[PDB]
Amino acid sequence: HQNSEGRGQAADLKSTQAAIDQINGKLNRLIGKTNEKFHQIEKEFSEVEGRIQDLEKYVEDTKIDLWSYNAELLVALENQHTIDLTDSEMNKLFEKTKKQLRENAEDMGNGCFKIYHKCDNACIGSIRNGTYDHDVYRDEALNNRFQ
Amino acid sequence: RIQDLEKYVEDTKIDLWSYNAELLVALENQHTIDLTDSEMNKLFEKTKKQLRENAEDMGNGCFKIYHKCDNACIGSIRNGTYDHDVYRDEALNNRFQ
Amino acid sequence: NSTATLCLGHHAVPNGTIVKTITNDRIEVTNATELVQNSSIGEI
Amino acid sequence: NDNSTATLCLGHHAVPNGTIVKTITNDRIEVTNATELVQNSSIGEI
Ligand SMILES: *[C@@H]1O[C@H](CO)[C@@H](O[C@@H]2O[C@H](CO)[C@@H](O[C@@H]3O[C@H](CO)[C@@H](O)[C@H](O)[C@@H]3O)[C@H](O)[C@H]2NC(C)=O)[C@H](O)[C@H]1NC(C)=O
Ligand SMILES: *[C@@H]1O[C@H](CO)[C@@H](O[C@@H]2O[C@H](CO)[C@@H](O[C@@H]3O[C@H](CO)[C@@H](O)[C@H](O)[C@@H]3O)[C@H](O)[C@H]2NC(C)=O)[C@H](O)[C@H]1NC(C)=O
Ligand SMILES: *[C@@H]1O[C@H](CO)[C@@H](O[C@@H]2O[C@H](CO)[C@@H](O)[C@H](O)[C@H]2NC(C)=O)[C@H](O)[C@H]1NC(C)=O
Ligand SMILES: *[C@@H]1O[C@H](CO)[C@@H](O)[C@H](O)[C@H]1NC(C)=O
């Protein structure tokens, strides 16, 4: 923010934590998923056996392909969701702020609000902490809006 | 040898189907959740764009209609026939003072 | 100078059911159906 | 800024040297940080 009292910036733990909470946890679906597999068929061969070896190769091969595709699709999906998740959590933060300001400001379009009254660092905290009552500054702000 | 392979087949099949199953449920659920929320989040927009400038978003998912609204206008919004222009002068004067 | 408030909302139920999605493993929904046949009849 | 106004911006995190990942839309997109899901290497002993 930039008001008459000067400049400054501070984080919002409430929404940021909601982003980490969904990532750390989406990992827990993927990190420890490993499942045991004991004594499968031999995927490697020394001599040439013909029909049986052709099948034993065709099995372990076609298994690998399907899992590789399944893997690629899973990453590309969890990525597209991870990108969309993070964007939404801040895009929510913008709306949560806008609904708080009521008529006392305007969307500049640069991802910033132009608050149309004298705001100290005190009122900035009431926005951040979430206690901003628009009704007091409403009369004060509306006159600045129209000129 | 044969029994080892015949087992390795039907097993590897089951694993691949189960992953496909788990992934399918978790996707159609996450899509179902987003769907139901969006369909209602749309109705709010349908109402706000219908009310024009005769109200304000209170933030709690309710509109504060800044004019006298009888049971007629409530049904007119219910219908989709709410004309903003009639109440505008009445409401617009109340918002700004 | 009389006002009126119009609010919007959605369905809700007391005892729901939990399902698993991409974001979270536990989430309560209104209504859900089972996709796995875990039992059978005793005869063919 | 005029002492009768006030300017409030909100934003998100960023980092200098990030990493490229693949999604559905695009093959290249830079994210803040990421981990590799494929164990490409191993130890020399059993
Ligand atoms: C919102 O939509 C509803 C649904 O159509 C409208 O209700 C309808 O209102 C009309 C006019 O009042 C009703 O017709 C009238 O019936 C009375 C019966 O006493 C009759 O005396 C009149 O000559 C006329 O025929 C109509 O019955 C009623 N809907 C139904 C299903 O019966 C309502 O008018 C709409 N909102 C507004 C603000 O108009
Ligand atoms: C909650 O979700 C379940 C699952 O979708 C709903 O159960 C389904 O309900 C419908 C209608 O109540 C059932 O259709 C009926 O099927 C019977 C026999 O199959 C048939 O005789 C009827 O004429 C009608 O077609 C459906 O079978 C049933 N189950 C499934 C798996 O779809 C339930 O209705 C939902 N509850 C609410 C309140 O939405
Ligand atoms: C990217 O950031 C994450 C944190 O969200 C890192 O995850 C680390 O490793 C495990 C989780 O898998 C935990 O010890 C912590 O959550 C993280 N620790 C630290 C020190 O970051 C992940 O390692 C990071 N990736 C890179 C390449 O730095
Ligand atoms: C908490 O909110 C109060 C107003 O209710 C504010 O004065 C205070 O600065 C806030 N504290 C923070 C943001 O740490």
Side-chain angles (χ1 to χ4, degrees), chain A residues 1-3 6-12 15-36 38-42 44-46 48-95 97 100-102 104-109 111-113 115-117 119-146, chain B residues 1-63 65-67 69-97, chain C residues 1-14 16-19 21-44, chain D residues 5-21 23-35 37-46:
Chain A
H1 68 293
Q2 187 185 2
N3 67 340
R7 284 198 165 180
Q9 89 188 351
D12 177 77
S15 67
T16 285
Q17 186 59 32
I20 309 289
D21 285 352
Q22 302 180 51
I23 302 165
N24 289 348
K26 178 202 298 294
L27 274 71
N28 284 40
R29 192 199 165 245
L30 281 61
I31 170 65
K33 144 162 143 34
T34 166
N35 268 38
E36 290 170 32
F38 294 2
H39 186 16
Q40 320 86 290
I41 66 104
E42 294 296 321
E44 185 170 311
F45 310 92
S46 319
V48 188
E49 287 159 315
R51 196 181 201 185
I52 284 300
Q53 185 178 125
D54 284 314
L55 169 69
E56 283 172 315
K57 285 182 176 183
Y58 190 67
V59 173
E60 183 88 294
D61 182 25
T62 201
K63 162 194 154 172
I64 285 164
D65 287 346
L66 287 168
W67 270 117
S68 297
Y69 164 76
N70 279 318
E72 180 82 39
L73 169 63
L74 184 59
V75 166
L77 257 166
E78 295 278 18
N79 285 1
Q80 189 70 68
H81 175 270
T82 309
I83 294 291
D84 293 346
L85 160 63
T86 56
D87 281 12
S88 174
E89 263 297 332
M90 191 213 55
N91 212 97
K92 282 175 57 176
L93 201 293
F94 188 80
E95 290 293 317
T97 292
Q100 261 190 159
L101 282 182
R102 209 92 94 84
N104 322 24
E106 283 186 78
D107 185 354
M108 301 194 37
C112 306
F113 298 89
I115 298 171
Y116 284 180
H117 65 74
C119 197
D120 323 318
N121 292 20
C123 47
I124 292 287
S126 81
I127 289 177
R128 278 144 53 196
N129 225 353
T131 54
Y132 178 90
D133 184 302
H134 82 98
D135 231 318
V136 48
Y137 307 150
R138 181 177 181 170
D139 268 303
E140 179 177 332
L142 263 60
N143 196 16
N144 283 260
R145 302 203 53 179
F146 308 145
Chain B
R1 194 180 196 186
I2 284 301
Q3 185 177 124
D4 284 316
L5 194 275
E6 282 176 317
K7 286 182 175 184
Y8 187 53
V9 173
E10 184 91 292
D11 188 300
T12 286
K13 165 190 159 171
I14 285 164
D15 289 347
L16 288 166
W17 268 126
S18 296
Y19 164 74
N20 282 320
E22 183 83 36
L23 169 62
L24 183 59
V25 167
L27 257 168
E28 296 281 23
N29 287 2
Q30 191 70 67
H31 173 271
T32 306
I33 295 292
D34 295 343
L35 157 63
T36 60
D37 261 13
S38 175
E39 260 301 325
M40 185 204 60
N41 211 98
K42 276 178 55 180
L43 194 76
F44 193 93
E45 294 294 319
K46 170 175 176 292
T47 292
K48 184 164 84 66
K49 302 188 180 303
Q50 194 180 192
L51 282 183
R52 193 64 152 274
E53 288 291 345
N54 306 25
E56 293 177 350
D57 185 351
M58 303 188 35
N60 66 341
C62 321
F63 298 86
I65 295 172
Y66 287 177
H67 67 73
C69 202
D70 43 346
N71 295 15
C73 51
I74 289 288
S76 79
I77 286 178
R78 196 145 109 200
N79 279 343
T81 57
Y82 176 90
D83 182 294
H84 76 99
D85 209 300
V86 48
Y87 307 145
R88 187 187 186 86
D89 265 304
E90 177 180 334
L92 208 39
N93 198 292
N94 265 100
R95 179 182 293 176
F96 310 144
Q97 54 193 36
Chain C
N1 45 286
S2 65
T3 168
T5 307
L6 170 59
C7 205
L8 288 70
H10 65 321
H11 202 197
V13 277
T17 170
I18 58 100
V19 306
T21 75
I22 287 300
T23 49
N24 40 26
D25 301 328
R26 301 266 166 273
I27 193 171
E28 189 162 9
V29 301
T30 305
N31 178 18
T33 181
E34 160 76 85
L35 296 178
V36 181
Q37 261 290 332
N38 68 335
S39 69
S40 94
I41 316 171
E43 37 195 350
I44 289 174
Chain D
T5 81
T7 311
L8 172 58
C9 293
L10 41 76
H12 63 71
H13 199 20
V15 277
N17 202 353
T19 174
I20 314 179
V21 306
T23 73
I24 287 299
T25 55
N26 47 270
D27 300 328
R28 317 268 157 72
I29 193 169
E30 188 158 9
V31 301
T32 75
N33 94 316
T35 176
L37 225 57
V38 180
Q39 258 291 330
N40 64 337
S41 308
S42 96
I43 315 170
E45 46 182 352
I46 291 173

